Design a protein around this ligand. Structure first.
Ligand code: HEM
Ligand SMILES: CSc1ccc(C(=O)O)cc1
Ligand SMILES: [Cl-]
Length: 393
C-alpha cells in the first residue's frame, strides 16, 4: 500500500537539487516509506498540513529530528517549546509569544530599518559583494544579537551553534556527526549567555527572565527559553534573507516590480520563504496507530514532513516554481502551522521586510557576478556564497 523509496533526503546530492526528488516523493503517494532511514515521509501540502495540525497524534516531545527521545538521549536537554507537547508547551509558548510580540516589534522597528538601510548603502559603496557573508549574514548579525541583549564577546559562536542545531535534527550522517564533535565550545558559550546576568536590560533575553514571576514559567525555565531564541532566531533569518535576495537575483522582473512598489517588501519576503523554504524539513512521532491519506502508520513511528515540497505542491499552488511577490501566500508552511507555528515570525518578517524595503528603494539591479556555492545542512536550505553586483538606483 505504501510505496518504499530509496531517496535519501539528507544526502548531498538531494540538497544540491531537491526538486525532482521532491516531485518523485509527492507523486509516489500521500505517504511514502523511506527505506534509507526507516521513516515515513509526507511531501504533499495536504498531508504535511494535516500532520502539523494534529499535535496529539503527531507529537514533538519525542523529538522533531530523526532521533526518537524515547529510544536515544537528546544531544542537549530538550527545548521547552519546540520539543514539548501541549499542555507543557503552552505556557512557555505564551511567554515567547508576549516577548516577541506586536509591541516589541514596535520598539525595535526603527532600529532594524535603520540598520538595513545603512547596510544596503554600505554595500553600494563596494558594488561587488557576497550577498551571503556581506548581507544575509552581516545584516541579522548587526541587529539580532543586540536585540537579544548579548554581550559582544563570543558572537562568532552563534552561527556555528545554529548550524549544529539544525544539522542535529538530521540522521546520524557525517554532517550531523561532525557537527556534534565540534559542539563543545559553542554549547558552552550559548549556555552561559542564557543566564540572566549576561543579558542586557530591554532585550529579548532579559524579557524572558522578567516573565518568570507570572506563574507561566519558573526561573529555572528561562535559560532554556533564551537558548531557544539563540538556536532558532538567527540562522533561519540568514537563510530567509539569503533566499529573498537570491530570488530577486534570479527573477529580475520581480525586482523591478518590487522597486516600483516597495510596500510589496513584506510579501516579497513571505514568497521567498515559501519558494525556498529555508527550513526544509521536520519530523513528528506518532503517539498511536493512525490512518493518514488512506495509509496506516503504527505507534512510535517517525514521520518526516517535507515543508519545502509542501510549498511547491502543484496540488495546492498555481505555478509553484515561480517567484511571485504578489502571490497570495497565506497557508504556506515555511513557518510551520498549528500550535508550533513559528513564534518568532514577527522578527523574521520585520527583518525581511526592512531589508527588502531598503533594496527596493536603493538598488536598481542585482546580477550574479560569480560562482554560486551551496551550503549543506540537514535541515537548512541556503547558500554558502552568492557573489552579486549591486547597481545603485
Ligand atoms: C525566515 C525565518 C524563519 C523560519 C523559516 C522559521 C521556521 C520555523 C518553523 C518551520 C517552525 C515550526 C517548527 C515545528 O513545527 O516543529 C518554527 C518554530 C519556531 N521558531 Fe521559527 N523560523 C524563522 C525565524 C525565527 C526567529 C527570528 C525566531 C526567534 C527570534 C524563531 C524562533 C522559533 C521558535 C522558538 C520555534 C518553536 C515554536 C514552537 O514550538 O511553538 N524563528 N520556526
Ligand atoms: C524551527 S527551528 C528551531 C526552533 C526552536 C528551537 C529551540 O527551541 O531551541 C530550535 C530550532
Ligand atoms: Cl547547548
Amino acid at each position: 500500500t505504501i510505496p518504499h523509496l530509496a531517496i535519501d533526503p539528507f544526502s548531498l546530492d538531494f540538497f544540491d537539487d531537491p526538486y525532482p526528488d521532491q516531485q518523485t516523493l509527492r507523486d509516489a503517494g500521500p505517504v511514502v516509506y523511506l527505506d534509507k532511514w526507516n521513516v515515513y515521509g509526507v511531501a504533499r501540502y495536504a498531508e504535511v498540513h494535516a500532520v502539523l495540525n494534529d499535535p496529539t497524534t503527531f507529537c514533538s516531545s519525542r523529538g522533531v529530528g530523526l532521533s526518537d527521545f524515547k529510544k536515544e538521549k537528546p544531544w542537549r536537554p530538550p527545548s521547552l517549546i519546540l520539543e514539548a507537547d501541549p499542555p507543557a508547551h503552552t505556557r512557555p509558548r505564551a511567554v515567547l509569544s508576549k516577548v516577541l510580540s506586536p509591541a516589541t516589534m514596535k520598539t525595535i522597528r526603527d532600529g532594524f530599518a535603520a540598520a538595513a538601510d545603512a547596510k544596503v548603502d554600505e554595500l553600494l559603496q563596494r558594488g561587488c559583494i557576497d550577498a551571503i557573508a556581506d548581507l544575509a549574514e552581516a545584516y541579522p548579525l548587526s541587529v539580532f544579537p543586540d536585540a537579544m541583549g548579548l554581550k559582544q564577546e563570543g558572537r562568532e559562536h552563534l552561527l556555528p551553534y545554529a548550524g549544529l542545531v539544525f544539522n542535529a535534527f538530521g540522521p546520524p550522517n557525517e554532517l550531523r556527526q561532525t557537527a556534534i564533535e565540534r559542539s563543545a565550545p559553542h554549547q558552552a558559550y550559548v549556555n552561559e549567555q542564557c543566564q540572566r546576568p549576561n543579558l542586557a536590560p530591554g532585550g529579548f533575553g532579559a524579557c524572558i527572565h522578567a516573565f518568570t514571576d507570572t506563574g507561566e514559567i519558573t526561573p529555572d525555565e528561562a535559560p532554556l527559553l533564551v537558548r531557544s531564541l539563540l538556536s532558532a532566531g538567527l540562522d533561519t533569518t540568514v537563510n530567509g534573507i539569503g533566499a529573498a535576495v537570491y530570488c530577486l537575483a534570479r527573477f529580475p522582473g520581480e525586482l523591478q516590480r518590487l522597486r516600483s512598489d516597495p510596500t510589496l517588501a513584506r510579501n516579497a519576503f513571505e514568497e521567498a520563504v515559501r519558494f525556498e523554504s529555508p527550513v526544509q524539513t521536520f519530523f513528528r512521532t506518532t503517539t498511536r496507530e493512525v490512518e493518514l491519506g488512506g495509509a496506516v502508520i503504527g505507534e512510535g513511528e517517525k514521520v518526516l514532513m517535507f515543508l519545502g515540497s509542501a510549498n511547491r505542491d502543484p496540488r495546492r499552488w498555481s505555478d509553484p516554481d515561480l517567484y511571485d511577490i504578489t502571490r497570495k501566500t497565506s497557508g504556506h508552511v515555511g513557518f510551520g502551522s498549528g500550535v508550533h507555528m513559528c513564534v518568532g515570525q514577527l522578527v523574521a518578517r520585520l527583518e525581511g521586510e526592512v531589508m527588502l524595503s531598503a533594496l527596493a528603494r536603493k538598488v536598481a539591479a542585482i546580477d550574479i557576478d560569480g560562482p554560486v556555492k551551496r551550503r549543506f545542512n540537514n535541515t537548512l536550505r541556503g547558500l554558502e556564497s552568492l557573489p552579486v553586483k549591486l547597481t545603485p538606483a
